[PDB]
Amino acid sequence: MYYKFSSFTQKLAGAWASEAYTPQGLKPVSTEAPPIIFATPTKLTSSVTAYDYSGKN
Amino acid sequence: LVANLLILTWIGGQPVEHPFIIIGQLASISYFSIILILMPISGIIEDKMLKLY
Amino acid sequence: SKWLDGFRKWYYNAAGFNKLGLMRDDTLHETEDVKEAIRRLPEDLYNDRMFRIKRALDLTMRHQILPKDQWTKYEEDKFYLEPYLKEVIRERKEREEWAKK
Amino acid sequence: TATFAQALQSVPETQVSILDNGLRVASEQSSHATCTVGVWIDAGSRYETEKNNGAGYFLEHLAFKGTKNRPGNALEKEVESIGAHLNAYSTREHTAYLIKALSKDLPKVVELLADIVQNSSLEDSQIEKERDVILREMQENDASMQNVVFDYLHATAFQGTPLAQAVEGPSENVRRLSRTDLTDYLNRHYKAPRMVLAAAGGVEHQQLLDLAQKHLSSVSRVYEEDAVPGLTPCRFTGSEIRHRDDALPLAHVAIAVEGPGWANPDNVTLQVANAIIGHYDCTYGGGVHLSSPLASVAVANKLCQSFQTFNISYSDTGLLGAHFVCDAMSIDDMVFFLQGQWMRLCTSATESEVTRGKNILRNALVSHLDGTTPVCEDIGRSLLTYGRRIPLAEWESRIQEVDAQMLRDICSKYFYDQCPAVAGYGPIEQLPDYNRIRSGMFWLRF
Amino acid sequence: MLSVAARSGPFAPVLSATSRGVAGALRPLLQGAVPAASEPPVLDVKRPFLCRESLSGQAAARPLVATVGLNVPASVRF
Amino acid sequence: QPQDLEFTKLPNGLVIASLENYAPLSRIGLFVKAGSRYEDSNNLGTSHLLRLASSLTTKGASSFKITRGIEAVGGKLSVTATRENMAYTVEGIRSDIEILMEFLLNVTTAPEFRRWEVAALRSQLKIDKAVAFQNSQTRIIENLHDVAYKNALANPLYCPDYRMGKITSEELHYFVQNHFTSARMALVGLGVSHSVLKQVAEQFLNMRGGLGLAGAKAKYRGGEIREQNGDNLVHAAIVAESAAIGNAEANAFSVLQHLLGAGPHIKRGNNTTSLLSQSVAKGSHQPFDVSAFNASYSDSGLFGIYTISQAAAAGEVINAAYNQVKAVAQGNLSSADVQAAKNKLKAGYLMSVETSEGFLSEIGSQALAAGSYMPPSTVLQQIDSVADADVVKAAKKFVSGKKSMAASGNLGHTPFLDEL
Amino acid sequence: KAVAFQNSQTRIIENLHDVAYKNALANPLYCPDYRMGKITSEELHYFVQNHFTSARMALVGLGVSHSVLKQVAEQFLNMRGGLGLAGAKAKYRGGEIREQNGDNLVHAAIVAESAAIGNAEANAFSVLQHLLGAGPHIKRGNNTTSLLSQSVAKGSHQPFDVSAFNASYSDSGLFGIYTISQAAAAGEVINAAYNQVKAVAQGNLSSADVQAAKNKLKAGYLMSVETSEGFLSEIGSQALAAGSYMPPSTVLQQIDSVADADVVKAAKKFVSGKKSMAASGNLGHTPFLDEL
Amino acid sequence: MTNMRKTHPLFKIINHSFIDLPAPSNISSWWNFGSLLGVCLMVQIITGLFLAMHY
Secondary structure, three states, X not given: OOOEEXXXXXXEEOOOHHHHOOOXXXXXXXXXXXXXXXXXXXXXXXXXXXXXXXXXO | OHHHHHHHHHHHHOOOOOOXXXXXXXXXXXXXXXXXXXXXXXXXXHHHOOOOO | OHHHHHHHHHHHHHHOOOOOOOOOXXXXXXXXXXXXXXXXXXXXXXXXXXXXXHHHHHHHHOOOOOOOOOOOOOOOOOOOOHHHHHHHHHHHHHHHHHHHO | OOOOHHHHOOOOOOEEEEOOOOOEEEEEEOOOOEEEXXXXXXXXXXXXXXXXXXXXXXXXXXXXXXXXXXOOOHHXXXXXXXXXXXXXXXXXXXXXXXXXXXXOOHHHHXXXXXXXXXXXXXXXXXXXXXXXXXXXXXXXXXXXXXXXXXXXXXXXXXXXXXXXXXXXXXHHHHHHOOHHHHHHHHHHHOOHHHEEEEEEEOOOHHHHHHHHHHHOOOOOOOOOOOOOOOOOOOOOOOOEEEXXXXXXXXXXXXXXXXXOOOOOOHHHHHHHHHHHHOOEEOOOOOOOOOOOXXXXXXXXXXXXXXXXXXXXXEOOEEEEEEEEEEOHHHHHHHHHHHHHHHHHHHHOOOOHHHXXXXXXXXXXXXXXXXXXXXXXXXXXXXXXXXXXXXXXXXHHHHHHOOOHHHHHHHHHHHOOXXXXXXXXXXXXXXXXXXXHHHHHOOOOOO | OOOHHHHOOOOHHXXXXXXXXXXXXXXXXXXXXXXXXXXXXXXXXXXXXXXXHHHOOOOOOOOOEEEOOOOXXXXXXX | OOOOOEEEEOOOOOEEEEEOOOOOEEEXXXXXXXXXXXXXXXXXXXXXXXXXXXXXXXXXXXXXXXXXXXXHHOOEEEEEEOOOOEEEEEEEEHHHHHHHHHHHHHHHHOOOOOHHHHHHHHHHHHHHHHHHOOOHHHHHHHHHHXXXXXXXXXXXXXXXXXXXXXXXXXXXXHHHHHHOOHHHEEEEEEOOOHHHHHXXXXXXXXXXXXXXXXXXXXXXXXXXEEEEOOOOOEEEEEEEEEOOOOOHHHHHHHHHHHHHOOXXXXXXXXXXXXXXXXXXXXXXXXXXXXXXXXXXXXXXXEEEEEEEEOOOXXXXXXXXXXXHHHHHHOOOOOHHHHHHHHHHHHHHHHHHOOOHXXXXXXXXXXXXXXXXXXXHHHHHHHHOOOOHHHHHHHHHHHHOOOXXXXXXXXXXXXXXXXXO | OOOOOOOOHHHHHHHHHHHHEOOOOOOOOOOOOOOOOOOOHHHHHHHHHHHOOHHHOOOOOOOOOHHHHHHHXXXXXXXXXXXXOOOOOOOXXXXXEEEOOOOOOEEEEEEEEOOOOOOOOHHHHHHHHHHHOOOOOOOOOOOOOOHHHHHHXXXXXXXXXXXXXXXXXXOOEEEEEEEEEOOOOHHHHHHHHHHHHHHHHOOOOOHHHHHHHHHHHHHHHHHOOOOHHHHHHHHHXXXXXXXXXXXXXXXXXXXXXXXXXXXXXXXXXXXXXXXXXEEEOOOOOOOOOOOO | OOOHHHHOOOHHHHHHXXXXXXXXXXXXXXXXXXXXXXXXXXXXXXXXXXXXXXX
């Protein structure tokens, strides 16, 4: 009701009573909404070498 | 200016002798003076006489 | 002086926009400053201006002029666009002065 | 009648002590009758191992629902016996629990902070209750498009790394996590040397240190497997995610490049660059005469609805860019103008806009630290990220030598000839391809 | 306790309206933007009632009747 | 150290307040008794366009000069409009102060109000009204204020839809000439010296010295409005007449609204220490949001309950909240609850003045209504001098008076005022 | 809906019906603003299958033999549920709604509950409505026989129109005053009409004026059945109302069978009852319900 | 039914440039010389074709 974490700079800005201290809605249940994902399906794998330049072996 | 171009056509027709050389000089400098400097000063005078500035 | 005023009135009569019923501020070339000078006019001056331009085009189309009783005389050719155009010029000048520094 | 630099030096600087636990306790005293006391823990979604992807979020939702010494709703009765507000947040790298109260009930606040952060009793019915609550809340948060585009930009920017995963996680991680996962997460990531006890307001450091010794001593002091967890550098890759949904009224597009990080000073320079571009909203009463060129072009051409610029920093990484919401028919034109502004910051950055951005950044840094709660938050994340609280005089000193040629050098280092990450949602059928955006990232003849 | 924004706890930014003439350094939370609002259809100019003689009969006395025709214009009976 | 807030009453009725925080940046507010209270039906929506004309041309400072100067110095110019009073606010760093104040004073002193400029930003007032009316609490509150009052306080904060395009410069000029007088003005400076703004107000605030036009005398009628919106959530506000600003009964009503529940104290909490929340949680098993709403002005106040519920469960929520406030009005309360309400009110007041802008708003309103600022310690000792019998009397006054209802949503099962 | 709301009297009477009734008669004829874009064919199918029953229909015909009606009636209409939904009994609410739209003229409708259709006092309310003024009879006339118009013409010096509005329904009814007037002069017009009805309520009337009102009502009723459209409309209304055709001579002798005591009783019922007000225009001087 | 002159892919160019192009009413004969110039160029090319294809 005083501060909410927002504003794209990671800052405690000012919000309302129903905006900051009630981030949940007043809906009864999770309705038949379009589904969500946050997962890139690229299946990218990065392998690092991290070798030593000395020891002559 | 339009009559000056007519004089310039007549001068360009005639060959290079006296006093067509000096009519050519005076016509060319009058042509350049009318197009370059005389018309904007005339417009300034016209705008000054119209209570514009 | 007096003779300069007389030649000014003679030049106004010989300019020829009083024969078509035009006022003096109607004949300004519509640049950008003149365009937002017209855009800031009230409705009655704007409507009279549009009718004056349309009547001038109608008279020019037939190569005719108004009768001498209907010509715009010197005393009623007031300067209605002058404060709007001068304040538009002033605000453009101060905008340019701000952008210069 | 003092000047700027003679007024920044009159600010009471914070003072920091370090316990035997590694609990770092920092306080700042002002002339106010209220105070804000909080605990900042270095435990976010970056540390999750793609099997407990909502464990910290579930713990944050379960932190206030009961502890061992105060079981149930009677808990909040005590913190409503003094009129104390309490808030919490969870980022990809931080987790904060804070209480705003008066200055005459500080020991109760510190005791409840310790009881929240180390004695959280996790009931079994509260697991399914908070499961339904967080399902409702993630549906409600995904009903707002800005957070959706934010999480899309993180998902497509740091893909294949544990930073791209969202704070709440997917539906399967909501459904399948139990009390054992939360117990393991609180045993592994709520350790003693990763906590800042930050107090701002009408408090003194000696009483706060005595309260931290009494209540917050012996949090973990152990690793339990002799296996120290750490952080790996997450690579930024250029990609483009387009969530086409043409029934939405407006379109949100966020385009970003890789930010340097928390510890790199040129972020300050980049902030001045953002202060050149700024932000615009449809309720702004400026008109046509706005100073920033992108917003003036947006008003004059009737392009935009609103836009912002962001410089987000995580541990040696980040996202720096812009986010605009507008109708479909504007989108690509605005992208052109947006890229043009960035190229101006690489090519034709003058001295007047640098001074204006510096003044805007000075007002942004000082105006945010009003009251107790933003000061306490700055203390907590400064001790968690920088390792120290940077004073405002040092902020002004770092701002002072920023001029035009180093600004265009830094902007050419970060904006010019880079592969950006683009996220879009809504009618984005006029959003250009990656070739057009990549070609707009550079110029042919500089 | 004057300044009723400080007196009314939750309803502080509802009873008062905040407008910014110059954008500040801090961007505001909950920016917000209008969607495409639906436009009303265009109609003719209403008949004015400037005299008492044309005002006679313009006050209703019996309940409303709405008539919709196929090739007949839609009529309203007062 | 920050010194005391020092005041000055000028002979032309101007109020002057200043404090020296030695802050890195200072804020300057100008508080005028020129809200939407002081309009009639002929010039409705004048306050909205006058609120958005804070960056228009003035005599001595154009729109371009004001916008470019304030954005170049990095300052912020804004306006907060209550129904009773308006507050212009500027803020900025030290090395600029006076010129920023000069701009603000121009915005108050001589706006010529060009016709093409207001013709330009009437579309901006349409956009701003749409943005503000995007959410439902604002719509409920303006409908409640329209129904509850008959004159002089039923005027909304925003221009009505029929007036959009019908505000001219003459009405704005009349509003400035009749309500922006020096007898209703307070110049407040947080972080800047007293003598500088005092001599600025001496040299520049000499335009109008009269009391202006006043004497609206807003009256109460009560009633009910129902708006079939169609959403699942149902919003319902039931209020009644309560005491104005300037009585101990106003403090009793504030203690009563903090006892009945004055908003969330817990992130995702359940509000155990609120009687209305306990009553509805005993009643229903669906999400809701019930609070006590109090809005007191200098002539009258509106106090009541505000509920957000489901479509099919509105009636039990309304009846449970009304039965809870009826049980409060019968004296069935404990002194520990009253002490908790007093502690919550004192903490809310002390945290309201945490920031500089809230403190500036508080001392500007105290300079307007009272003329001088009293410290928060005597405010807390005024709050602590409120008896619980006065709270019972305030609830008995609320339940025995006629009511104003504002409901919106799917109103099939929402009870009427006669059914209560 | 936009074309129907081009007139303002429709908006006044629909806001008035929204004020006066709690449910089942506050629903407007035209669609609400939120309803456009969310009416599906399932709702229309439900409405037809549970409201278009066979025992709620009257098939009427002019210029056609009865055997053809019998053939059509059994060959198309003979498969239905039979009764459909009942209703919600139309509870009375009362109150006032005032809206500000800034028109040049101010509309105000102030009604109260009256007798429903089929009652013996509905004819008394019709006689009272024609006594107080129920429309003009002369184009560009002065309407001297109407008492409300003459009272306001004694009062004001500006254009106006005042009439009596009546509406008879199945279980309830409305009767009151409709005034269209100027902005600043609305209060005097409203108060003058209300004092005229109040002076009627304690019996200040003549039997010749009641006879003139009866003659006006009989002439209007006989003129309503001149065309075939109005004749078929009233035949269908009577066939759906009571299920029995009633000849017009019985209606005329029913009209003549009311006395002025019943008119005084109807005026007293309107005066002493709870009010319902709908107002629009510049309402800076329009009064309220407690101000009357 | 649609208008052929305003929906054809080739004829909207020719009517927007030739038929319903709005021109000032008070244009004198001097502007007509410009049109003459165009057709003069055309006949030059025609004679030029006749100065090459047989010669």
